[PDB]
Amino acid sequence: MVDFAFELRKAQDTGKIVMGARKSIQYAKMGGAKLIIVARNARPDIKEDIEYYARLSGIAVYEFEGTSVELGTLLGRPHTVSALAVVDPGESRILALG
């Protein structure tokens, strides 16, 4: 089974990810992400924008079952992260979550 925490870190380290609602929304809008991940407690209008732009392009959206605090911590950051976009999965299996 896909280990979310392991594969997400592996994507971050071997691939290319962009972090935050602004950049996630932008990459969804441009059709440049392969997966968008949103924290459970991402602001409603942010989730709804991400879901919309992703739906326009056929990009998978995955809802992480933890808070923006936990998601930030998983990504090595001492701050919240509400959303991220996987641009290049690297050597990871992260896109299987779609």
Curated annotation (Swiss-Prot):
Q: Name one GO biological process term.
A: translation
Stretches assigned to coiled coil: none
Keyword annotations of the record:
Ribonucleoprotein, Ribosomal protein
Q: Name one GO molecular function term.
A: structural constituent of ribosome
**One Gene Ontology term, aspect cellular component:** cytosolic large ribosomal subunit
InterPro entries the record matches = Ribosomal_eL30 (IPR000231), Ribosomal_eL30-like (IPR039109), Ribosomal_eL30-like_sf (IPR029064), Ribosomal_eL30_CS (IPR022991), Ribosomal_eL8/eL30/eS12/Gad45 (IPR004038)
Which SUPFAM superfamilies does the record cross-reference, listed alphabetically? Answer: L30e-like (SSF55315)
**Gene3D superfamilies for this protein:** 3.30.1330.30
Per its UniProt record, what PROSITE patterns does this chain match?
Answer: RIBOSOMAL_L30E_1, RIBOSOMAL_L30E_2
Q: Which domain of life is it from?
A: Archaea
Report the sequence similarity comment from the record.
Answer: Belongs to the eukaryotic ribosomal protein eL30 family.
The protein's name in its UniProt record? Large ribosomal subunit protein eL30
Species name: Thermococcus celer
